[PDB]
Design a protein around this ligand. Structure first.
Ligand SMILES: Cc1cccc(Nc2nc(N[C@@H]3CCCC[C@@H]3N)ncc2C(N)=O)c1
Length: 269
């Protein structure tokens, strides 16, 4: 969990940025191999947020979720993770607009498998967006960015909160401050839309309070160009207003798994 600063070699160039500080590429001398890493580097609230985040990732063991190597206290606090070379999903789709439809279904299914696992593990993500999906290859996606994440209490199906990615948030989060796995299902809907719109921001040119107004009227973002109908049906299903009747990730992953098998069969035919 605690890494040795001497074994860590940072690079100058910064790969990305957030409120916390920077993301830089580096190397960590493992037992015999050198391993390529991404490091979150801070610029007291922020400090504690990094320790909590690291404590969450430590518990997570799945092929579709970013792996934490460990943490380090030097110049600043550093959270060290295995590296996803091709970067955040949204940027990638913005710069590769001819990625095939089958490839997108593949990647969002992988996110769904990682989210099904996370549900079973009783953690909520609370920031599930395409910028927080990281690509190892063009056919391998992983979920990261767990700074808003919560381990649910053994006696609760949701976490009660006390600045938010509003456009990814379910009605019950905005209205009642309650975040559950069904809430992440809602954001997955928005994530899919983002993926099929090739990295475009959702609800463009609308303020947070207008989006709320829109959803309450029963309005939803339209089908992206070239997006298969059944994938849009799945999006709308994820956007079930009422938590009770919204599907969980088991249902969502099953549906994505099966649709992907038809599309793979189609290709061969
Ligand atoms: C090429 C490139 C560019 C930017 C970031 C990355 N890698 C990562 N970024 C984030 N977080 C970022 C934070 C800033 C916005 C984008 C991301 N959400 N977390 C984990 C990783 C990781 N394990 O590799 C890679």
């Amino acid at each position: 969990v605690y890494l040795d600063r001497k074994l860590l070699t940072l690079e100058d160039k910064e790969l990305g940025s957030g409120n916390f500080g920077t993301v830089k590429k580096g190397y960590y001398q493992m037992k015999k191999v050198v391993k390529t890493v991404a490091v979150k580097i801070l610029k007291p609230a922020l400090k504690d947020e990094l320790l909590a985040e690291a404590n969450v990732m430590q518990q997570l063991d799945n092929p579709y979720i970013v792996r934490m190597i460990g943490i380090c206290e030097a110049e600043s606090w550093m959270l060290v993770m295995e590296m996803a070379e091709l970067g955040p999903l949204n940027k990638y789709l913005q710069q590769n607009r001819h990625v095939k439809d089958k490839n997108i279904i593949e990647l969002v299914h992988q996110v769904s498998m990682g989210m099904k696992y996370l549900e079973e593990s009783n953690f909520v993500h609370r920031d599930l967006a395409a910028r927080n999906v990281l690509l190892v290859t063009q056919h391998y996606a992983k979920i990261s960015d767990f700074g808003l994440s919560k381990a649910l209490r053994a006696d609760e199906n949701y976490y009660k909160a006390q600045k938010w990615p509003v456009k990814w948030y379910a009605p019950e989060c905005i209205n009642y401050y309650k975040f559950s796995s069904k809430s992440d299902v809602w954001s997955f809907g928005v994530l899919m839309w983002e993926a099929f719109s090739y990295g475009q921001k959702p609800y463009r040119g609308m303020k947070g309070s207008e989006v709320t107004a829109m959803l309450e009227k029963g309005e939803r973002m339209g089908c992206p160009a070239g997006c298969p109908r059944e994938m849009y049906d799945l999006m709308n299903l994820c956007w079930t207003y009422d938590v009770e009747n919204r599907p969980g990730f088991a249902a969502v992953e099953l549906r994505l798994r099966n649709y992907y098998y038809d599309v793979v069969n189609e290709g061969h035919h």
